Swiss-Prot record, chain B:
The species this protein was found in: Mycolicibacterium smegmatis (strain ATCC 700084 / mc(2)155) (Mycobacterium smegmatis)
Family indicated by similarity: Belongs to the RNA polymerase beta' chain family.
Role, per record: DNA-dependent RNA polymerase catalyzes the transcription of DNA into RNA using the four ribonucleoside triphosphates as substrates.
Gene responsible for this protein: rpoC
Superkingdom of origin organism: Bacteria
Subunit structure: The RNAP catalytic core consists of 2 alpha, 1 beta, 1 beta' and 1 omega subunit. When a sigma factor is associated with the core the holoenzyme is formed, which can initiate transcription.
Name recorded for this polypeptide: DNA-directed RNA polymerase subunit beta'
Residues of the full protein shown: 99 to 147 of 1317
Length: 51, 49, 52
DNA sequence: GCTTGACAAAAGTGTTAAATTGTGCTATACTGGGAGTCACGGATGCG
DNA sequence: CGCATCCGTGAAGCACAATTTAACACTTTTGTCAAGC
């Protein structure tokens, strides 16, 4: 999604079709990941770069 | 058009002048469009009678 | 071209009032608005040498 | 572990207008600039 | 060959053609949702 491994950001459907899921499924799992990672318990380590 | 490096046209000694056996002023006149110089001549019209 | 027009007008109009014309006076005769005149004056700028 | 469909915002196509950039042209006659020196070693030549 | 003397260097204004910007309608895609199967 963010292209961290290659540098090319990808749209939803473009990475939904590499697996066997729709674009909205990619959106749903992305929302899950954003909700889980955004929580302070993990963001406390990553925040200090530009807190 | 061709061009000659100034460091060798003059400098006491003038490397170009010594190389070609021309005085600095004579060489200066040729490089800088002030006098003509004969590049070569054919003997077939010098020793032909 | 327009830079020369501006320069000549600025040089000439001084005798009318005894001051170096400002953007208002210049615009009043160049038929252009002050902001464009300021842009022209900036555009007429020339680079200085580092070796000074 | 995830689909159908429906809406609105953002990413593209294309035509047109406006501005921005480059080359040419002007016919009385006029015809050649002007700017604030000495000291050093090396090439030439004299007997 | 032994050295002196001269020599050059350094220190006024527009017309028309072509190119380039950035307006806008429209199209497509991308992101988003409740409700749900």
């Amino acid at each position: 999604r963010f292209g961290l491994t290659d540098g090319q950001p990808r749209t939803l459907d473009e990475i939904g079709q590499v697996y066997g899921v729709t674009r909205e499924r990619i959106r749903q799992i992305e929302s899950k990941t954003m909700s889980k990672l955004r929580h302070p318990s993990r963001s406390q380590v990553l925040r200090d770069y530009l807190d | 058009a061709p061009v000659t490096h100034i460091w060798y046209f003059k400098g006491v000694p003038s490397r170009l002048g010594y190389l070609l056996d021309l005085a600095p002023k004579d060489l200066e006149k040729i490089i800088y469009f002030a006098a003509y110089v004969i590049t070569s001549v054919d003997d077939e019209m010098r020793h032909n009678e | 071209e327009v830079i020369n027009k501006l320069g000549r007008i600025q040089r000439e109009l001084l005798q009318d009032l005894g001051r170096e014309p400002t953007p208002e006076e210049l615009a009043k005769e160049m038929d252009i608005t002050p902001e464009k005149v300021l842009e022209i004056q900036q555009y007429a700028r020339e680079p200085i040498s580092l070796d000074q």
